[PDB]
Amino acid sequence: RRQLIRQLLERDKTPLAILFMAAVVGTLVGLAAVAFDKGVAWLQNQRMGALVHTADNYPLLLTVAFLCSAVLAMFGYFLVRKYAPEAGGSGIPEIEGALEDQRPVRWWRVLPVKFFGGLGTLGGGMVLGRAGPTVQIGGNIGRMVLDIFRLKGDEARHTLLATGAAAGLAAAFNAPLAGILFIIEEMRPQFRYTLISIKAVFIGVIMSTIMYRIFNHEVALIDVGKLSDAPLNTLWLYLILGIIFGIFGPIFNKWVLGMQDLLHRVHGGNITKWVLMGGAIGGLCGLLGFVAPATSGGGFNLIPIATAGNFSMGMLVFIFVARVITTLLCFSSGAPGGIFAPMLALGTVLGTAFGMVAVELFPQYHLEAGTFAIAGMGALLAASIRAPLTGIILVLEMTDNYQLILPMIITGLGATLLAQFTGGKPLYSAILARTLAKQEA
Amino acid sequence: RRRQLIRQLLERDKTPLAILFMAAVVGTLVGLAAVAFDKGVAWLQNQRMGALVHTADNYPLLLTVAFLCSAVLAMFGYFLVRKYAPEAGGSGIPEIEGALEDQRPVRWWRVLPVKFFGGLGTLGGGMVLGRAGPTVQIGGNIGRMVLDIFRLKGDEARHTLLATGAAAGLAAAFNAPLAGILFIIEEMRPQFRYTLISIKAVFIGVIMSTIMYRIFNHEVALIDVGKLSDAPLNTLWLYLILGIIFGIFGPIFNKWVLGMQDLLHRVHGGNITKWVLMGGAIGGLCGLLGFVAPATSGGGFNLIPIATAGNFSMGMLVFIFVARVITTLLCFSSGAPGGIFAPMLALGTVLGTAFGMVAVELFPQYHLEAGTFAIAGMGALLAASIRAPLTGIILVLEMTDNYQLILPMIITGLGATLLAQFTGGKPLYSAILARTLAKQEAEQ
Numbered sequence: 001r002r003q004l005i006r007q008l009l010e011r012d013k014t015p016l017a018i019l020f021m022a023a024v025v026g027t028l029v030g031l032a033a034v035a036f037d038k039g040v041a042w043l044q045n046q047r048m049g050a051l052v053h054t055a056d057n058y059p060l061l062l063t064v065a066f067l068c069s070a071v072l073a074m075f076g077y078f079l080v081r082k083y084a085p086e087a088g089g090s091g092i093p094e095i096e097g098a099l100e101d102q103r104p105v106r107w108w109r110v111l112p113v114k115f116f117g118g119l120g121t122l123g124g125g126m127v128l129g130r131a132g133p134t135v136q137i138g139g140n141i142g143r144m145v146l147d148i149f150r151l152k153g154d155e156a157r158h159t160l161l162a163t164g165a166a167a168g169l170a171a172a173f174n175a176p177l178a179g180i181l182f183i184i185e186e187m188r189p190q191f192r193y194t195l196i197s198i199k200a201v202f203i204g205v206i207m208s209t210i211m212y213r214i215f216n217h218e219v220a221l222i223d224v225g226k227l228s229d230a231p232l233n234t235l236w237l238y239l240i241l242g243i244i245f246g247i248f249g250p251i252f253n254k255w256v257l258g259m260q261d262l263l264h265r266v267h268g269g270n271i272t273k274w275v276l277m278g279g280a281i282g283g284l285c286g287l288l289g290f291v292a293p294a295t296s297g298g299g300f301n302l303i304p305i306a307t308a309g310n311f312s313m314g315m316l317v318f319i320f321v322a323r324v325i326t327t328l329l330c331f332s333s334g335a336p337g338g339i340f341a342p343m344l345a346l347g348t349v350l351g352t353a354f355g356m357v358a359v360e361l362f363p364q365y366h367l368e369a370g371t372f373a374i375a376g377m378g379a380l381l382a383a384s385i386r387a388p389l390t391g392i393i394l395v396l397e398m399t400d401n402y403q404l405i406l407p408m409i410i411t412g413l414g415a416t417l418l419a420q421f422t423g424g425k426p427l428y429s430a431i432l433a434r435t436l437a438k439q440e441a
Numbered sequence: 442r443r444r445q446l447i448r449q450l451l452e453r454d455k456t457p458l459a460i461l462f463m464a465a466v467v468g469t470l471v472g473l474a475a476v477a478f479d480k481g482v483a484w485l486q487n488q489r490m491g492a493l494v495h496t497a498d499n500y501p502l503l504l505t506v507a508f509l510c511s512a513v514l515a516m517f518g519y520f521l522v523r524k525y526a527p528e529a530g531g532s533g534i535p536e537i538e539g540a541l542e543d544q545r546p547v548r549w550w551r552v553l554p555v556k557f558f559g560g561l562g563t564l565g566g567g568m569v570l571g572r573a574g575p576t577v578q579i580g581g582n583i584g585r586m587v588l589d590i591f592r593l594k595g596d597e598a599r600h601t602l603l604a605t606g607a608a609a610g611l612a613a614a615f616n617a618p619l620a621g622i623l624f625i626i627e628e629m630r631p632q633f634r635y636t637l638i639s640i641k642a643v644f645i646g647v648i649m650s651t652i653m654y655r656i657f658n659h660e661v662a663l664i665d666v667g668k669l670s671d672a673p674l675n676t677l678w679l680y681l682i683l684g685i686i687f688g689i690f691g692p693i694f695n696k697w698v699l700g701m702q703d704l705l706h707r708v709h710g711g712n713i714t715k716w717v718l719m720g721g722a723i724g725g726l727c728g729l730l731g732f733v734a735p736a737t738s739g740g741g742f743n744l745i746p747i748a749t750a751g752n753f754s755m756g757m758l759v760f761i762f763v764a765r766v767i768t769t770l771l772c773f774s775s776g777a778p779g780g781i782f783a784p785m786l787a788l789g790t791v792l793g794t795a796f797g798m799v800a801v802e803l804f805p806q807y808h809l810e811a812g813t814f815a816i817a818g819m820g821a822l823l824a825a826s827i828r829a830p831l832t833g834i835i836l837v838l839e840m841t842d843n844y845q846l847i848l849p850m851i852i853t854g855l856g857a858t859l860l861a862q863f864t865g866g867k868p869l870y871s872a873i874l875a876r877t878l879a880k881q882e883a884e885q
């Protein structure tokens with residue numbers, strides 16, 4: 001229908017102003033995200049220097065461990081509850097909401113709350129990720145420049161809010177492709193056509209990523225080395241593993257949803273018990289972060305160690321269980337901060353474990369557990385969040401093990417296929433569902 | 442629509458188990474078809490090289506069996522297209538794009554044999570054409586056919602199995618799974634309205650397709666380029682400059698192919714016999730060139746590792762670029778079966794290499810390697826002619842494994858699309874589809 005013929009001849013003509021403004025969004029979200037990340041790090045730092053100041057009296061130092069974190073945690077629970085509730089939890093359900101035009105981007109409130117609130121809960125050493133925070137911060141940045149410059153239209157509101165969020169993923173993980181992919185596979189409205197210019201999201205993601213490289217060059221977030229290739233007669237192991245991730249995904253999805261409810265009892269909704277709960281979780285974490293640091297924190301540190309088979313089978317069973325616990329706690333409590341990255345650490349440990357059984361069950365295959373570690377790494381993403389293409393492309397950008405691309409994709413699909421066949425749902429879709437339903441009811 | 446949204450969010454990613462199993466089937470068949478296509482094209486280029494040795498003395502006799510061998514295989518492919526499947530002329534990407542708009546018909550009983558055997562002619566003869574088009578149309582048609590055969594009803598199913606055939610078709614062509622999946626969701630899928638295409642199922646298609654390729658292609662890369670040097674932040678501004686160069690060149694290239702499409706239409710007028718004859722003449726020029734200056738002819742994949750590695754003179758790069766622009770325009774604008782996608786990789790590499798060269802001398806403080814610019818230029822003519830930058834970026838990544846080049850690769854790609862937008866240019870597949878949808882009415 002000729003309408004088409006007119007459309008094909010007018011394809012990819014993004015309004016110059018939407019382009020130039022993406023340049024500024026990415027830049028700002030870039031610096032913001034760098035600053036966030038540098039911030040978080042500095043406080044985990046001080047906490048380490050304070051444990052040295054009191055390095056002798058074991059119960060004293062077990063106390064300043066708890067307290068430095070407990071206090072920082074409360075500052076974050078508080079800052080959210082008092083000024084910006086939409087900035088509790090992840091921030092991706094929220095930004096997805098915004099692109100649907102079913103949630104308000106209150107940038108004058110969320111930027112400072114999420115930034116300094118994230119700073120506390122993360123910097124205190126809680127099991128939460130930078131992924132939600134940075135995407136929320138970035139969409140808000142993008143909304144804020146839309147306002148300030150008074151850009152009018154649907155395309156301008158949707159695009160700038162989108163490039164903002166891709167750039168915030170790009171910057172937090174040094175993952176320009178994964179940034180771009182997360183917008184198209186998860187973030188943009190899933191059930192209707194939208195006017196989100198891709199070339200504009202790209203530009204935003206470049207400037208965001210460059211900013212990261214100005215302040216972070218020479219050191220990568222994960223360094224795993226170059227691992228062995230994967231023989232064709234080995235793949236069916238990767239299928240079995242994605243199946244294991246694909247049954248676990250939904251179960252872990254039930255648990256985050258339920259535990260949200262069961263933590264919502266403890267405080268009833270009340271800013272004083274809610275802040276006091278948060279600093280108990282906060283204290284528990286900063287305490288865990290000294291007596292068994294692998295059960296606490298973001299968990300990036302234990303990834304290269306798991307991938308190189310440097311853990312024993314027991315330690316991995318612990319670390320995994322310990323972390324399912326400290327993940328549900330930290331995230332289902334309402335604290336500002338994601339579940340995304342802490343899934344990276346869970347996916348890795350699960351894999352490495354599976355690889356270890358493969359190595360001893362099939363020595364003819366000449367296996368390396370680190371190759372199951374790397375396929376598992378983003379399998380939880382694929383199985384819970386249900387965004388496999390982004391899960392895969394992200395791990396690719398962080399490990400540089402491209403010869404593993406088939407094992408990674410097979411574990412991915414095996415994950416998303418069993419998640420779907422066991423009634424699980426996209427977690428960030430479930431959360432935005434819960435929030436829209438509790439809204440009109 | 443808040444209540445419809447809650448209903449919809451909770452019902453997300455629930456692809457009908459039937460469509461998932463079929464994507465598996467489409468994958469596998471496309472994979473095999475792509476491998477068979479790849480091996481068949483290779484066997485003819487090889488026989489042809491066997492004949493040249495059979496006659497390796499008498500130069501004019503050998504310059505003659507060089508011509509006739511291509512000429513015959515060319516005609517045979519032109520003929521099969523004009524006689525049974527006109528839609529299988531050109532690339533086959535505009536076509537499967539049409540089919541995704543429900544504006545073009547997937548006549549798989551006629552296209553599979555025409556595209557396959559007629560591509561085998563034009564590529565195997567040694568013409569300048571890519572595998573991407575052919576294996577994409579082929580793959581989508583295979584998709585259609587398992588749709589018909591199994592009588593799957595749905596709008597989902599038709600678009601899905603049509604999309605997983607195109608994706609499995611690009612994946613198996615380049616050993617590039619990610620590139621295939623991404624080509625669908627950036628370029629192939631209908632651009633101006635919502636659609637019911639399951640990505641999960643396209644994924645399964647792509648997996649199976651790539652596994653088939655690995656069963657019959659293991660241990661030997663399409664492009665080995667080795668690991669190259671990194672790129673420092675103060676190098677970036679140079680890639681942006683290279684993107685811009687591509688960005689103004691992209692559209693200029695696009696006009697020639699459209700133009701050359703017309704000017705060649707005059708030589709035959711529509712006539713199956715001049716067209717076949719002309720095709721066999723073009724063909725014979727290529728098979729001749731393939732012996733007397735091989736880098737000016739054929740797929741291009743051979744001279745990519747060479748260029749990336751600095752082994753060409755600036756005089757050779759300039760020579761190869763111009764002759765190749767010329768022969769790529771001859772072959773694709775003549776409407777033989779075969780795409781323009783892959784030969785744009787080669788053109789791009791060469792152009793970048795050339796730039797890397799001049800960047801190396803002009804700035805020894807930077808410690809450059811021409812090959813980092815060759816690699817950022819590989820998927821750049823893609824960026825500015827075909828305007829699918831996320832695809833050529835992930836494509837090149839998958840084929841050269843040089844991830845540390847990600848920033849310059851992006852940057853150059855973006856630079857290309859922006860200057861391609863800004864100077865009037867359109868997506869090439871979209872402008873070919875359009876000229877065809879418009880012709881659909883022109884004679885009314």
Ligand SMILES: [F-]
Pocket residue numbers: 128129130131132133337338339340341342
């Ligand atoms: F996160």
Ligand SMILES: [F-]
Pocket residue numbers: 090132337338339340341
């Ligand atoms: F999260």
Ligand SMILES: [F-]
Pocket residue numbers: 570571572573574575780781782783784
């Ligand atoms: F091609």
Ligand SMILES: [F-]
Pocket residue numbers: 532534571573574779780781782783
């Ligand atoms: F093509």
